[PDB]
């Protein structure tokens, strides 16, 4: 991936290594950012641990509503989507169209990802 | 606004006349599906589709909306989910102004309604 | 207006965005942040661990499949924290937990219906390699020597491993290590622990090209020589 080569070089680093499915995994200030190409998109994903999300089987609705309210509140300025994965665990995602993405843009969305994580994580932990 | 013709045409395709010039925020009220807003902000057109739910319908809608907007479960468009106040499910998609077309706008609308429908099934 | 039989009509006037009504009641850049290629880090840690653990064929196959068992059912919604807890339940040694994770991943390679579990295990491998990588590599590195020592006398395996790792990662000086040795091996053979340490750390020293690294190990090595004269 030209973009990831460019980003690595811009940071003065060796090129990043992808797994066999072409997924990259960067840990940035302790936050995992997965970058996964699918067809014409590049998808950023950070799984979130949220112990208070469910007590046993019971989903915390007050929390879920609050997080979805925040998701709407950030929508105009951040492209990120809050979702539930196949384990029913929260994940912060961003779907980027490769037709329109340059290295600058990738870096900006990564910056935005970390910004939102730093806002969210404190609400889901001690 | 140069995108007015696309929005005007979209509205006319739904049988809704509009007077020119159009506002940067157009609001269409749907009898069952709720409130659709077409908002031009910066170089983006975002469709927001908001619907008030009865209390006993809210929890399952939250979970399904989050589940069905995961990239793995999604289609061509970046549909997203949120919530407003007590009881309004909000589904939305942002479109880049510089590549907006009438067919794109129609599918954004149709795919938001489809999502809402799966979310509330 | 209509769409698929549903009536639709415009509402006009001064309006406010649905989103703005949300924002009403609810950027540090990359070059300034710590960044690691976690794909490289997880691969590097596994390479290092496997190399050492091959020297002491003392399996984790039982833990793996017992862990496998707890996932087909276990939870409806499996979290990383839950997985971590199960690993820690099976072994208090981080290098063993990491090995068990590698075994689980390989156990799931074949099983495409459990790809969700595969995904979680990859997350955990990443977390462990990033947050505990040094602790993992040192634990594997000392495992063969700690196992030989423990199988030949009264000094148990885990305290040997912890004593070595503490000496490398956070040495607190000669009086502290003596106190730790007494606390950890009150009925053991402390002379033998000391010799085990002298040997492992001196081996470490032979590969350290640093200057600072040679000096740090030097201090512990010098201190151990003196402590051997406590008996």
CATH label of the domain that carries residue C6 = 6.10.250.670
Closest Cα partner for B10 from B109, B114, B115? Answer: B109
Q: Is A58 helix (H, G, I), strand (E, B) or coil?
A: strand
Do C131 and C220 lie in a common domain?
A: yes
Q: Collect all residues of chain B within an 8 Å Cβ-Cβ radius of residue A120.
A: none
**How far, in Å, CA of C87 to CA of C99, rounded?**
10
Copy the structure tokens of residue A57.
Answer: 């089987």
Tracing tokens 């399904």 back to the chain, one arrives at B64
- Nearest to residue B11, comparing CAs of C73, C2, A24? C2
Find the closest chain A residue to B78 by CA distance. A95
Same domain, C113 and C17: no
**How many A/B residue pairs have CB atoms within 8 Å?**
77
Query: How many domains in chain B?
Result: 1
SS3 letters across B20-45 = CCCCCEEEEEECCCEEEEEEEECCEE
On whether both C51 and C146 belong to a single domain, the answer is yes
C25 and C115 in a common domain: no
Q: Does any CB of chain C come closer than 8 Å to the CB of residue B14?
A: yes
Beta carbons of C17 and B90 less than 8 Å apart: no
Query: How many domains does the structure of chain C reveal?
Result: 2
Residue A54 sits at the chain B interface (C-beta within 8 Å): no
Region of B21 on the Ramachandran plot (φ > 0 left; ψ -120 to 50 alpha; else beta): beta
Are both C126 and C21 inside the same structural domain?
no
Q: Residue A30: its chain C contacts at CB < 8 A? A: 34, 130-131
**Contact at 8 Å (CB) between C55 and C144?**
yes
Q: Which domain holds residue C10?
A: 2-31
The chains found to touch B (3+ Cβ pairs under 8 angstroms) are: A, C
A17 interaction partners in chain C (CB closer than 8 Å): 37, 39-40, 43
* Helix axis angle, C190-207 to C157-169, nearest 10°: 50
Q: For residues A24 and C43, is the Cβ–Cβ distance under 8 A?
A: no
Q: Please name the method used to determine this structure.
A: X-ray
Residue recorded with tokens 């973009």: A3
Are C158 and C66 in a shared domain?
Answer: yes
| Residues composing chain B | 121
Same domain as C42, residue C25: no
Across C44-76, b (16+ Cβ under 10 Å) vs e yields: ebbebbeebbeeeeeebeebbeebbeebeeeee
Compute the distance between CA of residue B94 and CA of residue B42 in angstroms, rounded to an integer. 11
Domain boundaries, chain A: 1-126
Residue A41 sits at the chain B interface (C-beta within 8 Å): yes
Cα A79–Cα A85–Cα A89 angle in degrees, nearest 5: 100
Looking up residue B48, the CATH number of its domain turns out to be: 3.30.1460.10
A103 touches chain C (CB under 8 A): no
Q: Chains meeting C at 3+ CB pairs closer than 8 A?
A: A, B
Instruction: Please tell me whether residues C100 and C14 are part of one structural domain.
Output: no
C160 and C188 fall within a common domain = yes
Q: Measured between alpha carbons, how far apart are the two ends of chain C, in Å?
A: 96
Q: Does C76 touch chain B (CB under 8 A)?
A: no
Q: Which residues pair with C7 in a beta bridge?
A: C2
Under CATH, which architecture does the A1-126 domain have? 2-Layer Sandwich (3.30)
The answer to whether B63 faces chain A, any CB pair under 8 Å, is yes
CB contact under 8 A, A27 and C36: yes
């Amino acid at each position: 991936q030209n973009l990831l080569k460019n980003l690595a070089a811009s940071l003065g680093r060796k090129p990043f290594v992808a797994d066999k499915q072409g997924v990259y995994r960067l840990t940035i200030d302790k936050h995992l950012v997965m970058l996964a190409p699918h067809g014409s998109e590049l998808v950023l994903r950070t799984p979130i641990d949220a112990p208070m999300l469910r007590e046993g089987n019971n989903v915390n609705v007050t929390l879920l509503r609050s997080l979805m309210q925040q998701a709407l509140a950030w929508a105009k300025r951040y492209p990120q989507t809050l979702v539930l994965d196949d384990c029913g665990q929260l994940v912060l995602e961003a779907r980027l169209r490769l037709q329109e993405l340059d290295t600058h843009g990738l870096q900006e969305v990564i910056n935005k990802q970390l910004a939102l994580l730093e806002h969210l994580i404190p609400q889901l932990t001690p | 606004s140069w995108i007015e013709p696309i929005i005007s045409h979209f509205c006319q395709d739904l049988g809704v006349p509009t007077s020119s010039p159009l506002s940067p925020l157009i609001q269409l009220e749907m009898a069952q599906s709720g409130t659709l807003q077409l908002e031009q902000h910066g170089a983006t057109l975002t469709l927001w589709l908001a619907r008030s739910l009865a209390w006993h319908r809210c929890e399952d809608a939250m979970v399904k909306a989050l589940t069905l907007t995961a990239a793995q479960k999604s289609g061509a468009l970046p549909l997203r989910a949120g919530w407003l106040g007590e009881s309004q499910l909000v589904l939305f998609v942002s479109l880049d102004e510089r590549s907006l077309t009438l067919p794109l706008l129609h599918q954004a609308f149709e795919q938001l309604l489809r999502l809402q429908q799966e979310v509330l099934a | 207006x209509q769409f698929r039989g549903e009536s639709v009509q415009i509402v006009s006037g001064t309006l406010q965005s649905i989103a703005d009504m949300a924002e009403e009641v609810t950027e540090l850049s990359l070059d300034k942040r710590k960044l690691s290629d976690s794909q490289a880090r997880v691969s590097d840690v596994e390479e290092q661990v496997n190399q050492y653990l091959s020297k002491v064929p003392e399996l984790e196959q039982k833990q793996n499949v017992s862990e496998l068992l707890s996932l087909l059912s276990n939870s409806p919604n499996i979290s990383l924290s839950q997985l971590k807890a199960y690993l820690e339940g099976k072994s208090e040694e981080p290098s063993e937990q990491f090995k068990m994770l590698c075994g689980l991943r390989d156990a799931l390679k074949g099983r495409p219906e459990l790809a969700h579990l595969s995904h979680l295990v990859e997350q955990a491998l990443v977390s462990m390699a990033e947050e505990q990588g040094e602790t993992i590599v040192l634990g594997a590195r000392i495992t063969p020597e700690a196992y030989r020592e423990s199988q030949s006398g009264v000094n148990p395996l885990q305290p040997l491993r912890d004593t070595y790792r503490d000496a490398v990662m956070g040495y607190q000086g000669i009086y502290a290590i003596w106190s730790d040795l007494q606390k950890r091996f009150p009925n053991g053979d402390i002379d033998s622990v000391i010799l085990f340490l002298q040997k492992a750390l001196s081996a470490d020293l032979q590969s350290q090209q640093s200057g600072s690294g040679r000096e740090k190990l030097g201090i512990v090595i010098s201190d151990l020589q003196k402590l051997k004269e406590f008996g």
